[PDB]
Structures are given as C-alpha cells and as structure tokens.
Design a protein around this nucleic acid. Structure first.
Lengths: 908, 398, 400
DNA sequence: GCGCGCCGCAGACTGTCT
DNA sequence: AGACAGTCTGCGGCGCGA
C-alpha cells in the first residue's frame, strides 16, 4: 500500500494475491537506469461512500452499465433490422411538411412521424444557406417525406428557428435514428438544440464504417487510387472509402451509387427550385435506401466484431453533444474576421512601400550590388510615332491647341505603354490604368509572388525564393562555393553544394516555425520590412479557417424554449440568445474510433499574435447552468505505462517508463517529455512531439527527420549523434521502454484491445491482410486505448449521475478531455461525480492489464474546471484586449481535492 | 530623431527655431507653416467626410471660444491673484475691479459643453430620433504649467447622443471607426493604438494613442457620460431631454469622442518620416495623397522656350479649377540642378512633379515624376487632370 | 425682422431670443450659428480661400494664434482683452483699484497674454519666414480666416467675429496700384454671388499714416454697414515689430531691393453671411442663396409607397451624392409626410436649391420629381443623370 | 495522399506600323 | 502587306483543406 503510494480500495476486490515473484523484478529494474531513492511521500487519502458493484466485479460492473441503458437502442435496432420496407413510393407530393408514405399511395398527412426507428439523411441547399432541405425519413411504417418549406416561397431571412425536421414527439419513448453523416443530419433533426437534456441518441453509419474496415492514412489513399509497397492487397477488397459512393458498392453491391451529374443542388439559388425536384427526391430516397441496406447488414457485424457494449454505448453518447454559443459568438464572427481584413490591408501596404523604395534604386545603377534585386529586369523603353486685362483665354487656347495635338503622333490609340521608364518588374505588379480595376501604386502584389522575398530582405544569407530548380527550398545552411560568401544565389546551375533542400520536408507552412531564431529575419529596414512577415504569423490561423469557423449554423432558441432554470436568474438577458451549434463531427474518423472535426476538435489554446485563436473560448453556458470539465492529467503516457504492467512484472514498476509520469512531476524530477529531453536533447517544446513519435510508434527515421527539421545537424552527424534517445529508450526488440506486448497486440489475431476486446479494422487485420506496413498499428493501439478510455467515461455517469438527480449528458470531448453541461446548483457535486468516473475507469484499466490495485497519484484529477466558458486553463486570456471585458468571466477554479462530507444524494 | 529641421526648412511648423517636443505637444508653438495649415485643412476635411457628412444624424455645430456666464473656480492650479497669491501680504490702497471669478468669463477647454448646450435645439432640428451626433472642429485653450501659459489645440469633437441600452456597443463602434480613421492615412498603422480605461465613478471609456519615438502619446479620448452632465445643465425637467428610441422616450447617454488635430498632424508627420538597410537615405515625407498639402509641382524646363510659361499657367489654372493644389514652381528663378529641387519637393511631400520642357510644344509630352517612385514618365499633357483625380480618388478608396 | 425668425426656425441662427436684436448679430455677441449657418460659413470661407489663396499663385496660408503671448505688452496701449490665462476676461477697466497694479504686478498690464483683435499681426510676425518661402519675391500675400475677439460696449461683452485677413506685401511704387487691384477684385467677389449687386458698394477714406483706404459697404435695410476694409499701411508696423537691422526687412523687387508696403484687406464673414441672407430674401418665403454658397444643395425625400424599398434606393442615392461631394438633406427616414405645400417652401426656407421626390415611378422606370428653388416647375429625371445635372449645376453658376 | 486555387512561363495568335 | 510590336492561354509546379 505504502510501497508505491497506493491507496486502499472500497471496490474492485479480488486482488487478494500479493503479486509474488513480481515485486523483486520491479526492484531490480528500478535500481537499474533509475534513481530508486525516492522519498515516496504518501498522498492524502480520500474516503467517500461509493455506489456498489453490479456483479461484484469491475468487468461485471462496466458490463450492464452499457446494457441498463441502450437496451431501447438494442430493441429499436432489432425492430429496424427485422422489418421490410415498401419498395418505392412513386407520387412524392409537395403536401405540407411531414407526410406519411405507406405501401399504398394517397399521401396521408401526419404532423410528426410516430415510429421508434428511423433512417434519415439531409442534403441541404448550400447557395440558399444552411436550412435543411430534401430530407426523407425512411421507416418500416412509411417513407415520410419532409419537404422543409420548399413549396412555400416566403420564409424568414435570418435568425433561423423552428426550421428543422422535428422528429421528436411530445410525451403526451426512445426513437433511434440512423444515417450516413448523422452529425450533418443531426444539425437538422430539431430539438437537439434544446437546453434541457434529450432522451434520444443517434447512430452514425460512418461510425460503424470506420469502426470495422476503416482506413488510416496510406491505405486510405491507396484504395482511393485503386477504387511494404507490395503486399497481399486484401485491404483493398475488404474495405471501402469513408466518403459515400464506396460503402454502398462494397457491402450492398449492385450499382456503385446513383449520383446527379449536373450537380446544381449545391448551386441552386431561389431560382431552379421547381425543376428536377422529383428526380432529386428519387436520388435521395435511393441513397437513404442504400444506407438502410448497409446498416442492416453491418448491424450484426459491428455488434459481433465489437462485442463489448461499452463501445456501442460510447458511440451513442459521444454522437450527442451540445455546444451553447452565446449571442456574442456572432460578434466573434465579426470582430475577428474584419480584423483579419485590416491585417490584410496593412500588410499589402507594407509590401507596396517595399516596392516603391525599390524604385529609388537604378539611379546610376544602384542595383547589381544589392543581393536581393540584382537579377531582376530593370529595363527602359520609350517610343512614339503616328479689369486691366483678362489674359486668361490665351492660356486656354494654348492648352486647347495642345489638346487634340495628341491626334498627330499618337503612338497607339489604346495605350500599350504601361508605365514606360519604370523597371520591368515594376511594369508588372501594377494595374493596367485602362481597366476599371486600376488602383494606385504597386497593387495586385502578394506574399506568394517570387518578387516578394526579394522586396523584403529575407537575409537568410541572400534568400531569393526563385521557383525554377527550387522544389520549395535551396542550399542555405553553411560552409563551402559560389561567390565564396555564403551566397545562395550566385551560380545555381552546376552544384547545389551545402544542400538543405533535400525533398521530403512538409513544405507547407513549415516556415511559420523557425521565424523565431533559425535565421529567417525580415531585413534591417524596420518600418515596413519587419512589420510584414510578422503579420502573416498573426493571420495564419484565420487565413485557413475563416471558412470553417463561419457557416457553423446556429438556432437561437425562443423564450418558450428556454427552461425554468434559464428564466428568472440573477444574471439573465432575454436580448442575449444562447442557442447552440451542433458539431459536424464524426465519432469515428480514422482506424481508431476517435471523434474527428477540423473546426472544433483541434489543438487551439488561445495563442497570442493569432487573430482568431479564441475559438475554444466563448461557448458560454446558459444562465443557471455550468460547464464542468477536466483535462486528463496524463492520457497516453499513463495508458502506455500501465500497458507495460504485469508482463515485465506487475505493481506498476515494470520499466523506467512505468515508474515515472505518476510519481514524477513537470516542475521537478523526470516525468519523461520535456524534463528529461532537456537533458538528453536540446528540444524544449519539441521534446513532447519527439517522445510522442517514440511512444506513438513511428520509428527511427521519422524521429531522424523530425530532429533534422529543428537543427543544423548534418546527416552523418544526425546518424552518429543526438539520435541516441531512440537507441537508449528502445534496444533491439523486433531498455527503459518496452515494446514487446505492444507488438504482440499489434500482431494479435481476433482480440486486439485489452480492456474491451474491440477488434481492429479488417484492412489492418493480420490474418486476411499481410500488414507488412507497420508504424500505424501501434498508433491504432494507443489511440484506440484512449478511445476505450473515453468510452469508459461515457458509459459511466450512469447511476452515479442517472439515479442521482443531476442534469447533464452533454459530451464535449475534444482530444483527451471531457466536458459536461450541468446545473450550477450541483456543479461542485457534478465535479465530484466527474472525479468518481475518473477513479472507476483508471481502476478498470488496472483490472484488465494486470493485478487489481491502482496507485493514488492517478486515482483522481489534478483539476476539474467549473468555469463558465471553455478554455484550456481557467486563468487564461486571449488576443482580444481583455477577456473579462465584454463577455463576463468568473475565472474558474482548479478544485483538485474531493469536495466535502455532504451526501452523495442531493437531499436538499 | 531630429526631423523637425525639415518642418522648419520647408514650412510645415512654426517660425521659432527653439522648438521642442514639449512645446508642440502642449500647444505653445508660435504657429504652423502654410503647408502645415493645408495639412490641418486636409485632416479636418477627411474628418468631416468620415465622421460628419457620410454618417447619418451627425450635424455641424459651433461653440464660442468664451463662456460669458458666471461659473465655478475652474481648471487652474493658481486661484487667480485675488485668493492664491496677492502682492505683498494683504495691502489695499482703497469694488468693481478685483471681483475674482464671480463675473469673469472662461476660455473653452472642450467642445463638449457647446454641443451639450445646443443639444435641445439640434434635437428640435431633427425629428427627435435618439441616435444623434454633433460634430465640431475648433481651437480649445488649455493652461500649461511650465512655471501659466496658453496652449491652443485644434480639437475635433463628436458628441454622440445614444440610447442607454445600446451605448455600450455604440462606443465600441466608434472605437472601431475612429481607430479605423487613424489606421487610414498611416504608413505604419501599428503605431496607432487604443486602451480601455475607467472613470473615477466607474464610467468606462477608451483612449487612442500614437507611438511617437519618445513615447506613446494621447491623441483621442472616447468617454461615456451616463446623464451626469446632461441632467446637471438642464435640471428643471427631464421632459425636454427625452428622445425617441424606437417607441419609448428616454434620456440619452452621452459619448464624447475628442481628438486633437495638431497632435494628429504631428503624428502623421512623424509617421511619414522613416537611415538603415539600403543606402537610399532620401529625406521624403511619405504623406498620404489625400493628406498631402501640395499634390503636384509644376516647373519650367532647362531649354530656353519662353512661350511655355503660358502653357504652365494654363495647366496651373485647369488643375486649380478641379480641386488640385499646385506648387507654382514655374515662377522660380536660378534653379540649381534638378536633384535638389526634387529633394525639395520630396521634403514638402508633393506627390508629382510636372516638368514642362522645350519638347512639349510639339507632341504634347510633359515629364511627370512620382513621390513614391523616383522615375519619370513622358505623359501627354491632356488627360493628366483625369489621372490626378483618379489617383486621389482611388488612393482614398484603398 | 421676419428673416430673423425664419432663420431661427430653419436653424440658421442659434439661440432662443437673445439674437433677435440686430446689434447682437452686428457684433459677435450672438450665442452662435445654426448647422445651416455653420455650413454656410464653411462654404463662404472655402469660396474665399479659392478666390484669394488658391487662384492666386502668390497668396499663401498663415497661422495666427488666437492669443498673443504678451510678455512685453505695452502698458495702456492696445489694451483690449488682455487678461486671458484661459479663465479670466476683465474687458476694459476705466477705473482700477491700484493697490500695486491694475489687478497684480505679474498678472495685469504685464505678462497678461492679450487675445487677438486682428489677424494682420500674425502675418506680420510670419513675414520673415514667408519671405524666405517666396525666395524674397516682394508682392506676395498671407491670408487666413480666423476668429477675432473684440470688446462690445453695465458689463462689457465679448464679440467673436469670423474675419478673413489678406496681408499684401508689395513694393511701394505699385502699392496703390495693388490697392486698386484688390479694390475691384474683392468688390467683384462680393458682387459675384449677389442677387442684387447694387447693394454692395465701396468708398474711399483717409488716415494719418496710411494716407489712403477703401471701405466696402453693404446696404442693409437699416443702412450701410462695413463688411470689408482696405488700408495701405507703410513700413511703420514692420519696422516697429522688427526694430534694428533692416537687412531682413527689405526684399527683392524688379532689379533691386526695397522694404515692402503692406495692404490690409479685412472682411467680416459674419456680416457677409448676414448680407447674403438679407440679399437672398426679397412673395413666398424663400432664401435664394447662390448655388456655390447654399449650405444644402439637394433635398432627397422618401415619397409614397413601400417604405423599405424606397428607403434602400434613397440610401443608395444618398451614398452616391455623398461620394460625389454634394451635400444632401435627408428628407427621407422621416415618417411625418403631411401633404403638399408643406415640406415644400420649407426647403425653400432652408435655401435648398433642388428637392427630389422619389416615388413609385422610380421603381417603375427610374423617374423622380425635381422641383427648383428658383422656379416652381417640376421635372421628371432619371436617377443616373441626377448626379450629372447636379454637377453641371453649381459649376454653371460659378462660370457666369 | 489527390483536386483546386495561384503564380511562372513559353507559345501562338493578335494587332498594328510603317 | 508583310515585318514586326504586344494579350490571352494552355502547360507545369507548389502548397494546401475537404
């Protein structure tokens, strides 16, 4: 108990064995490559009355945690499986909203579909906006056309509400909904925007498609192009692309997919709404029939290849999210985006002066000694060939005689001489003066033009960025050669000596880092040179993501949709609308079943000198409610540490990896990552990426090029020195790191995940497919173990949150993190429940990988945030001048300890 | 650093040679040069276009330089000579004179008081819609304690009367738009900045700054006044102060946007000037085309053709007709080479130089030189007026 | 007298009742001007700037401060509005309590810092550097519109008069000829925008050292009042303000060097505004101002029909006329719309040259009603040629 | 790992000049 | 009337987001 700072256990018994003949292996491997002289101070013990077990075992507890709930989602799935749909409705009338389309015709109108099982899809009118259109709800009762006010021309302009399909009936049951991209249709289900919780959950067709026979990176494109480098090619025929028109041909068969060739449905304005509406509705009905058939045949395959119900229930609860954005979220869509426009118009102006000051050369050939603008044109051209008295009309007649004198010796009628006398590079990059697009100075000049790194002095020993014979980069490092100065651009043609442009770089904003040091300055001019090349660092985030942050459709709910908790609060505004945005996130986006979204699920942490990095911020809770969330203190490190348990002996002291990251700290000691690789290597923040390259399972050459990216190491210097972290951590296996059972799990046949038994994708299955690629399956093991941890939290908060009277159930999991929107009155107790699930899941993983005991240092959270808004840490700021100004901030709390000795029930 | 010699050499600044930063920032300069007066007129015209005539419900108003009525002790550290400091120690030789500040007027220190006085009449002029504005550019007097003196500052002030529920975002809108007016016409817009600030009684507000080389200096204040001054000046009733916001009659919150155009002129003069990187140490004042005091410089060529002066007068008059200010450099005598003349027009911030030469009586070609690029264009004498108008208008656009 | 209440009702003249007397408007003790009066003053100052400073290649701007520093002010000599220091105005003290001085030794009659009474003195200080500006060419000018503070005669009031000064440095041999130049040019400028130019006149006068002068008068209904004065003062002011070396004082004239005579042309723009108001007024209540001088050019209205579409097209026409530089009254965004014969002859009392009625005919084919201030006829015009008609107007009146 | 933008660049035509 | 100025246009590459 006190040997490794372990804690006593109220639950999770059956660990009566002492782990004999495994302790002294831990002792002898702790004394080798380890200090072993840790004081091992005991953490303060926590005592509270926990809910009891289900079948007096943790495996029997987490099983039927996913079967007490989602049993309606098993019988509704069975009811959808057993029944047979009518073949085709031929009429497809306009009618008004919902209409029941049975086996007969006759178009009987209904208000809402009264069925427990629905297969559903929405294809929206993109040019009109984000309003739902063309949604058909196929079902064993009826096909259930929903035209969504396409017949009626008059509609609201903005502030969309009460628009989507309204699948949920009033109480005066569970209604399982399936669909391909069910997040996209889930934004148009209606009543998923409601502030109170919903009894109804979702299934995604692509979730089962990437759960079994998914594709990670290389196989995904290889089978796109097909439709070691030499293998059995069974992953070709066993799997299909995550996008549509590939899943239907693989599993159902027959036709590949129907597809509209004209493709004007994404380009349809208020015109062209009546033409080919029936053919569009037929194509949509055939698509939903295809999704119905593939879901019907993939239901038992998914339920048997993933036999643990925790995976299915975790997909069910992770499919539902609720991200309540405030009324000032659109303000974030204004004051960021226009600011980007400002930094678009300043920087270009800072370019233009750099052109104009470049024209102050050539006076007596001031170029040809300047290393930036010597190889440019600088050519001249000119040709032409066909009162006391008024005393004012003489000047007028003199100029009017000089007027019309242009008619003789006009060189050409329409002027071909576009600024003659200016240099030839400045005869380019200037508007014509004949077109209406004329604007003064050297406009239509951008950063990506080749003359731009010559205008501003890049001063990487004379960096030209000339595109011919470049491939993105050039010989720029050091040493000997050319003009015997470092001289990148003297004589390019014979030798690229001292080459730094060996092809294989990312070449895609890899120069956003190495702005700070690593040469890459912006000249000694000061006023305009260094003012630019910092602005693109400010707008690099918003330049690539202004399309994704915008067009996130929001339904501002009315006053009637606000529940009693929101109305009549000390802090409340009826002018401030708190309608949510539902994330368009697939719950399985790769070989692992991790949620993937390019907009919301990224690594954004409110970085300064970035225009729109406050995307994770705002998302304000509704009044009377609180977002309660916690970052996992060490996600993949702990999972790989307890993965090493009980195969090079138990008691969590198998390797030096297993000893650290729970007793060690970031501030002091060696907890791997930055603290020990600031001694082994020179990386400080890149050490985390390097150690993730080791643990994630990339190998030696990925780490070699990764450390080649950040340093002036030569390739023989890279091979001989500073790559010894991989050599010392990993000896010959296939020292401080163990990769043995990681490789055996990577080569296991049917059981793959240790904690749940969820199978791998059949493309990566080692029996049917000779997976000789490697370096992706270990990524599957670590990331899918993180997925199983996420699913084990999501299957939790049932009967520690269900029978207890707290509201919640809004999973806002991003990367390694869990958020829940609960009530403010029980927010601290909800954080206590969020600590209880962290105790239970870490005990579950300790139950599966060896022994039954769990250390105290990982048994609870370092912090659980009870902040109003979403942020990485509660005491952060943003690039806007003050975060508390404008939107109100309560600044959050860490709350590292257990709360108090109040009742686990409410009992108010 | 010592660029101010140019503003004495080419007459943008005052006559007196012992000019410093403190006298310019305080307002104790002897005056401004004619180019400085024209730059002030350009700044006032750009302020009137961006603030007054384009924006609806902004109206002109005038405030008198003196306050005739009786008033409080006022903004003076020394309480006149009747109370603070008397000659000798309380000696009297003998009323109407030496009556202190009981019947003594006051020079204005702000344009806010005149606009607040004219609010009821200007609200009578409008149809009592509550989003409203009163704008004025005028000289305000401030006591400077050099140890007493007078500082005269050309203040541009917009007093925006706004409904109280939307005042918190109307101030943010004017925060964006006024700072956008300062971001415009700037070679380095990052030097212009803003700061959020609070009153002693909790009223919020904002202060606009320019980063001068010595340090950051205040150029414009945006302040929120929650009925503290409007109710005090008219305390008889609140019925006349009520304005129509939507359907309801409410008392308007006040927003004072007061910037100083003399220090804004000095900020733009420091922003235009920029001895590093390339060896092109050319003393050029890179003013914007819509703020430059002289747009074009017109000259006589080296060739001895006397008749071209008539052509110069004709071009001078046709450019004066359509709103383009011309330097009459064709009248200049003993011109000593073109390079120092071009440097003179670069220091005076003249966008273009027109050289009428001997070869313009035939083929109509006059030489044209730009301020930004030191290159010559043999452009025909016709349609140069259209080219200058297009250059000014499309530089105003972007 | 009816012109006073028309100008107050249509917001030319500010103040409730204190400006009704013509003595307050003849001096500068009126409380202020209306927004139409302020825009008219800006128009008059801009036209004076074009006629005097812009169109003459030798006349240059000058910057005169509103106060003198007054560190060496002469005792009991030009001692009008001396006290200042931003917080006191003691006016004129015929009786004084001389305990040690008028008020104090360091405050009154020494280091008082007198406010300005005329703008001639600022041009006379800036003469040396502006002589350096014209490369010592003698017959050049310094001109400025500025506020002049005067005593107004139990207490004495402050008169703030907006006046334009032109100070002409000239060789003395042609100085009277340059007086005859400005004598006819300023008079024709005052007769340029006059509906009846016979009211404006000029007369000759004599002084003790200048020995000549001309006063420009306007025939107000009460009598003739001074609006501009001209004086050929000698080098007494220049040698008095620069005692000692005359080497900086004399300038380069034709083949030689000589000290310059000074011409003072001082015109009151406030009395000029009152003169042009009394000239514009003459059956129906109208203000027939000059098109170059009228504060509002065109009056755009909303008409009758759907308010939203007419509001949008009126906003577009408003933005087009603003971008083309024409000041336009927003008679739209007002929902009153009583009837005919009101909102017409109210714009005539606001001296607006044209009024535009945008109706449903504009949504049909683009035609709008134009009614002129000078003539009562209405004309149908397209939107696109409204700007061209308005830009050919005003400029047509400029080129008579 | 591909499509689609966004620049270079090298024809090949286009248009005008004498 | 061909000799000889210049404006689209159809390729290759580079990056880079769905």
């Amino acid at each position: 108990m006190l040997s490794r700072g372990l804690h006593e256990q109220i639950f999770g018994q059956g660990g009566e064995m002492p782990g004999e003949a495994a302790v002294r292996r831990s002792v002898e491997h702790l004394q080798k490559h380890g200090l072993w002289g840790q004081p091992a101070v005991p953490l303060p013990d926590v005592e509270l009355r926990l809910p009891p077990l289900y079948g007096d075992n943790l495996d029997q507890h987490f099983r039927l945690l996913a079967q007490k709930q989602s049993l309606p989602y098993l019988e509704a799935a069975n009811l959808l499986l057993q029944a047979q749909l009518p073949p085709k409705p031929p009429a497809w009338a306009w009618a008004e909203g919902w209409t029941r389309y049975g086996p007969e015709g006759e178009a009987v109108p209904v208000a809402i579909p009264e069925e427990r099982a629905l297969v559903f899809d929405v294809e929206v009118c993109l040019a009109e906006g984000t309003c739902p259109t063309l949604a058909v709800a196929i079902s064993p009762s009826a096909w259930y056309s929903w035209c969504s006010q396409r017949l009626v021309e008059e509609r609201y302009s903005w502030t969309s509400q009460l628009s989507p399909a309204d699948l949920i009936p009033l109480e005066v049951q569970e209604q399982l909904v399936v669909g391909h991209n069910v997040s996209f249709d889930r934004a148009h289900i209606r009543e998923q925007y409601l502030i109170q919780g919903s009894r109804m959950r979702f299934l995604d067709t692509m979730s089962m498609h990437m759960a079994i026979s998914g594709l990670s990176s290389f196989q995904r494109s290889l089978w796109i192009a097909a439709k070691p480098a030499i293998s059995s090619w069974d992953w070709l025929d066993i799997s299909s692309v995550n996008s549509l028109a590939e899943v239907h041909r693989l599993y159902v068969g027959g036709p590949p997919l129907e597809k509209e060739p004209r493709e004007l449905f994404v380009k349809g304005t208020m015109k062209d709404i009546r033409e080919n509406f029936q053919d569009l509705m037929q194509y949509c009905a055939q698509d939903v029939w295809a999704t119905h058939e593939v879901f019907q045949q993939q239901l038992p395959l998914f339920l048997e290849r993933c036999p643990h119900p925790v995976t299915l229930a975790g997909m069910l609860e992770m499919g539902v999210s609720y991200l309540p954005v405030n009324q000032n979220w659109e303000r974030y869509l204004a004051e960021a985006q226009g600011t980007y426009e400002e930094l678009q118009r300043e920087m270009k102006k800072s370019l233009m002066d750099l052109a104009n000051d470049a024209c102050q050369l050539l006076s007596g050939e001031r170029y040809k000694e300047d290393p930036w603008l010597w190889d440019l044109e600088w050519d001249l051209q000119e040709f032409k060939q066909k009162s006391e008295e008024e005393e004012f009309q003489q000047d007028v007649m003199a100029r009017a005689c000089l007027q019309k004198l242009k008619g003789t010796t006009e060189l050409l009628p329409k002027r071909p001489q576009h600024l003659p006398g200016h240099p030839g590079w400045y005869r380019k990059l200037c508007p014509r003066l004949d077109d209406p697009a004329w604007t003064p100075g050297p406009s239509l000049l951008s950063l990506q033009m080749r003359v731009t790194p010559k205008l501003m002095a890049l001063t990487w020993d004379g960096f030209p960025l000339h595109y011919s014979e470049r491939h993105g980069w050039g010989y720029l490092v050091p040493g000997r050669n050319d003009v015997d100065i470092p001289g990148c651009w003297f004589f390019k043609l014979p030798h690229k000596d001292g080459n730094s442009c060996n092809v294989g770089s990312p070449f895609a904003k890899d120069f956003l880092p190495k702005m700070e040091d690593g040469t890459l300055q912006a000249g000694p001019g000061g006023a305009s040179g260094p003012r630019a090349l910092e602005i693109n660092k400010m707008i690099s985030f918003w330049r690539n993501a202004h399309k994704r942050i915008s067009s996130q459709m929001v339904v501002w709910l009315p006053r009637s949709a606000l529940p009693r908790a929101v109305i009549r609060h000390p802090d409340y505004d009826e002018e401030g609308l708190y309608g949510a945005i539902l994330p368009q996130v697939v719950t399985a986006g790769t070989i692992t079943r991790r949620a993937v979204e390019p907009t919301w699920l990224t690594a954004s942490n409110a970085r300064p000198d970035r225009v729109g990095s406050e995307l994770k911020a705002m998302v304000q809770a509704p009044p009377g409610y609180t977002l309660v969330g916690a970052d996992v203190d060490s996600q993949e490190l702990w999972i790989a540490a307890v993965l090493g348990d009980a195969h090079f002996a138990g008691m969590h002291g198998c390797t030096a990896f297993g000893w650290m990251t729970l007793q060690g700290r970031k501030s002091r000691g060696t907890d791997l990552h930055s603290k020990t690789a600031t001694t082994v290597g020179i990386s400080r923040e890149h050490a985390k990426i390097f150690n993730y390259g080791r643990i994630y399972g990339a190998g030696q050459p990925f780490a070699e090029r990764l450390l080649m990216q950040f340093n002036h190491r030569l390739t023989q210097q890279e091979a001989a020195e500073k790559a010894q972290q991989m050599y010392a951590a990993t000896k010959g296996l296939r020292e401080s790191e163990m990769f043995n059972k990681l490789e055996s799990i990577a080569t296991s046949d049917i059981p793959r995940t240790p904690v749940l038994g969820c199978c791998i994708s059949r493309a990566l299955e080692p029996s049917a497919v000779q997976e000789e690629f490697m370096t992706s399956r270990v990524n599957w093991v670590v990331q899918s173990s993180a997925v199983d941890y996420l699913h084990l939290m999501l299957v939790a908060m049932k009967w520690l949150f269900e029978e207890f009277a707290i509201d919640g159930r809004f999973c806002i999991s991003i990367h390694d993190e869990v958020r829940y929107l609960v009530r403010e009155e029980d927010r601290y107790r909800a954080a206590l429940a969020l600590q209880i699930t962290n105790l239970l899941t870490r005990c579950m993983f300790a139950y599966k990988l060896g022994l039954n005991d769990l250390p105290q240092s990982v048994a609870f959270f370092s912090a659980v945030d009870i902040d109003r808004c979403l942020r990485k840490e509660v005491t952060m700021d943003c690039k806007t001048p003050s975060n508390p100004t404008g939107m109100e901030r309560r600044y959050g709390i860490p709350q590292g300890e257990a709360l108090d000795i109040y009742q686990i029930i409410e009992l108010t | 650093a010592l660029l101010e010699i140019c503003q004495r050499r080419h007459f943008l600044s005052g006559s007196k040679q012992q000019l410093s930063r403190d006298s310019l920032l305080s307002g104790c300069h002897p005056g401004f040069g004619p180019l400085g007066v024209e730059l002030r007129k350009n700044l006032a015209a750009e302020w009137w276009t961006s603030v007054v005539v384009f924006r609806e419900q902004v109206f002109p108003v005038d405030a008198l330089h003196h306050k005739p009525g009786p008033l409080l002790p006022g903004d003076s550290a020394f309480r006149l000579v009747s109370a603070e400091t008397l000659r000798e120690i309380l000696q009297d030789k003998e009323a109407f004179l030496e009556n202190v500040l009981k019947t003594s007027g006051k020079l204005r220190e702000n344009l806010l008081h005149g606009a607040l006085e004219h609010y009821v009449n200007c609200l009578d002029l409008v149809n009592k819609r509550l989003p409203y504005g009163l704008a004025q550019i005028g000289v305000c007097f401030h006591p400077v304690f050099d140890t007493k003196s007078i500082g005269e500052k050309t203040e541009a002030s917009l007093v925006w009367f706004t409904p109280p529920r939307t005042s918190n975002q109307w101030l943010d809108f004017w925060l964006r738009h006024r700072l956008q007016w300062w971001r415009k016409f700037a070679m380095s817009p990052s030097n212009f900045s803003s700061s959020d600030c609070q009153d002693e009684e909790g009223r919020k507000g904002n202060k606009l700054y320019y980063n001068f080389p010595w340090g950051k200096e205040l150029i414009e204040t945006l302040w929120n006044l929650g009925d503290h001054e409007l109710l005090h000046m008219y305390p008889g009733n609140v019925s006349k102060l009520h304005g129509r916001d939507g359907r309801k009659n409410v008392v308007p919150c006040v927003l004072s946007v007061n910037g100083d155009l003399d220090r804004g002129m000095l900020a733009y003069l420091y922003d235009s000037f920029q001895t590093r990187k390339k060896n092109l140490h050319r003393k050029v004042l890179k003013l914007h085309p819509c703020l430059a005091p002289i747009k074009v410089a017109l000259d006589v060529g080296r060739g001895p053709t006397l008749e071209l002066r008539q052509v110069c007068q004709g071009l001078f008059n046709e450019l004066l007709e359509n709103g383009i200010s011309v330097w009459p450099g064709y009248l200049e005598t003993m011109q000593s080479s073109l390079e120092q003349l071009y440097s003179k027009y670069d220091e005076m911030s003249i966008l273009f130089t027109v050289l009428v030469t001997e070869t313009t009586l035939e083929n109509g070609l006059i030489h044209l030189r730009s301020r930004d690029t030191t290159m010559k264009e043999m452009m025909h004498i016709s349609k140069l007026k259209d080219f200058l108008i297009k250059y000014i208008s499309s530089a105003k656009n972007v």
